């Protein structure tokens, strides 16, 4: 949907042979709490043999952007399973928030590599602190000094079926 970023913290159920098991944390992007918590359990299944029935969720907490009005260059690290194997990817996303960058990347995977939200693994998302460290030209093209571009051929949305003037694609 429109994403949120969660931390989900869990552990195996305590035992006589082990009180206070290790606490494990993942940062998870999902639409809501329930999807995020299931996401946690799936990844925790894969990482090491912890069953959902054998453990618990010790916390779940939404993570917000520290500066949700500062445009960042994001470096996103992705593995996935479409359509005939598995892959690594690295996408630059110039954007404002981590959740918006992640939603943009999920839309990009659906658009190009034809992969669903269950097929995509977000490995690490990082604000590129230094503009010299951006590697993709399609993001590095907006970083140049005194950037200006027009929006040629404006199409005016018309609420009326008929118009009495030939429309103009000006400014």
């Amino acid at each position: 949907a429109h994403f949120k970023e969660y931390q989900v913290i869990g552990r195996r159920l305590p035992t006589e042979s082990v009180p206070e098991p290790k606490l494990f944390r993942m940062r998870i992007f999902a639409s809501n709490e329930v999807i995020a918590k299931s996401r946690y359990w799936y990844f925790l299944q894969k990482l090491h043999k912890v069953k959902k029935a054998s453990g618990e969720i010790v916390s779940i907490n939404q993570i917000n952007e520290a500066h949700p009005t500062k445009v960042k260059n994001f470096g996103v690290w992705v593995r996935y399973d479409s359509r005939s194997g598995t892959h690594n990817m690295y996408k630059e996303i110039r954007d404002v928030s981590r959740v918006a960058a992640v939603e943009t990347l999920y839309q990009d995977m659906a658009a190009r590599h034809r992969a669903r939200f269950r097929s995509i693994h977000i490995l690490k998302v990082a604000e590129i602190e230094k503009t010299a460290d951006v590697k993709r030209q399609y993001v590095k093209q907006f970083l140049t000094k005194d950037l200006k571009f027009p929006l040629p051929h404006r199409v005016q949305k018309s609420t009326k079926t008929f118009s009495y003037k030939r429309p103009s694609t000006f400014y």
Partner: peptide
């Protein structure tokens, strides 16, 4: 092509000590 390769590499190489530091008393 990830930019922070060396940083995460060093971080996880520091985390290889725990798999052998603690297990024996």
């Amino acid at each position: 092509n990830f930019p922070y390769k060396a940083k995460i590499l060093e971080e996880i190489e520091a985390k290889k000590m725990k798999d052998l530091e603690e297990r024996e008393l």
